[PDB]
Ligand binder design. Structure first.
Ligand SMILES: N#Cc1ccc(C(=O)N(Cc2cccs2)C2CC2)cc1
Length: 132
């Protein structure tokens, strides 16, 4: 059913998790379930790996994903998420630039994602699929 789906394994995406900035990810298979997409059964989720020195993984709703082209998208993603926010505290935090450990890790993720973007889907799957 790959053709009916917005993303496939190896596609680079930005993911939005509450309390975190938009983060560079790669759509991948769940190491235990062996699936990359599912219905939580009307809304679609995708399994993603978060790039960086301390990688993580999650099932994310399609509405919290944006196709990754590059770092230049980040500014508009922050602005759009801020305008879409209900609470004033949420808006303020979204536009506040990342700092410390998290900023360094986000930058490491970008570096990894940009290398992955320059490769074919097959090549990046082989190189950037973090085992679990
Ligand atoms: N290198 C690195 C790094 C990777 C991941 C995260 C991270 O905690 N989350 C939240 C999570 C949701 C589910 C599992 S983890 C991601 C950024 C949103 C932080 C740093």
């Amino acid at each position: 059913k790959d053709h009916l789906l917005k993303y496939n394994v190896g596609d680079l995406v930005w993911s939005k998790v509450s309390g975190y900035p938009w983060w560079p990810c790669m759509v991948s298979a769940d190491p235990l379930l062996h699936s990359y997409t599912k219905l939580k059964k009307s809304a679609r989720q995708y399994h993603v790996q978060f790039f960086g020195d301390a990688p993580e993984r999650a099932w994310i709703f399609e509405k919290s994903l944006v196709a990754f082209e590059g770092e230049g998208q980040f500014e508009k993603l922050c602005q759009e998420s801020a305008k879409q926010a209900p609470t004033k505290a949420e808006k303020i935090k979204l536009l506040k630039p990342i700092s410390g450990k998290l900023r360094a890790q986000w930058e490491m993720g970008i570096v990894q994602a940009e290398e992955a973007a320059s490769m074919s889907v097959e090549e990046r799957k082989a190189k950037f699929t973090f085992l679990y």
